[PDB]
Design a protein around this ligand. Structure first.
Ligand SMILES: C[SH](C)CCC(=O)O
Ligand SMILES: C[SH](C)CCC(=O)O
Ligand SMILES: [Mn+2]
Ligand SMILES: [Mn+2]
Lengths: 125, 125
């Protein structure tokens, strides 16, 4: 199949969040648990000011596509600023974090080379 | 490795194009041939007004993330307009095309679950 999604497409899907990531919420836009797509999966995340996608890692490589705001990417200990217009590559099992130190919402898509988000087990650093 | 890319980062890289796709050009932002990265690869593409990413297919699944402009996505014969903020899922081997019928540049990222772009074999449909 071929399909098109945007935030409006997933209006009926509630935002997801977890205690370990303060100020972060997300929705699944391309995901086998919702769509029967496979091979790649994609979500959309918002990080509120002060929010932190806490240091973690997981087996699959990952890409972030930053679409709004600015933040601080923790590259396994080395900090680098990121902003709208950036893409980020995270090698499999590399520890990474994303902090929103700005006043605007930090927004990005993530992509995994998996059918679904639930196949990706996130381990804390 | 973990790294960040944007258009500024790849200024030194020349735009790629082929007579196969008039009015289309691209750069590689996350790609084994440039970065030694693996698992996922990503490029940035532009389609000029009247440009056509001609109907084609390839083995791996693909995602588009539209960052600007508007286009007509050909979903194996069923057309749908896409615009900034849309993401597109294309199943492996599904026939797809992307035409820019608008006045502004159609810009998007593409993502493959492959180490590099050059290993993807596209066939005209
Ligand atoms: C935004 S979350 C649903 C997890 C993000 C990540 O693991 O990089
Ligand atoms: C922008 S191109 C380098 C081809 C992308 C695609 O396979 O749809
Ligand atoms: Mn991650
Ligand atoms: Mn394609």
């Amino acid at each position: 199949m071929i399909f098109v999604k945007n935030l409006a497409s997933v209006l009926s899907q509630e935002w997801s969040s977890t205690e370990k990531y303060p100020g972060v919420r997300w929705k699944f836009l391309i995901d086998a648990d919702f769509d029967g797509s496979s091979g790649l999966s994609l979500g959309f995340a918002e990080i509120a000011p002060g929010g932190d996608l806490t240091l973690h890692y997981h087996s699959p490589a990952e890409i972030y596509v930053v679409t709004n705001g600015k933040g601080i990417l923790n590259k396994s200990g080395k900090l680098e600023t990121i902003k709208k217009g950036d893409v980020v590559y995270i090698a499999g099992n590399a520890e990474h974090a994303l902090k929103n130190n700005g006043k605007e919402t930090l927004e990005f898509y993530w992509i995994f080379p998996t059918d679904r988000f639930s196949e990706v087990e996130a381990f804390p650093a």
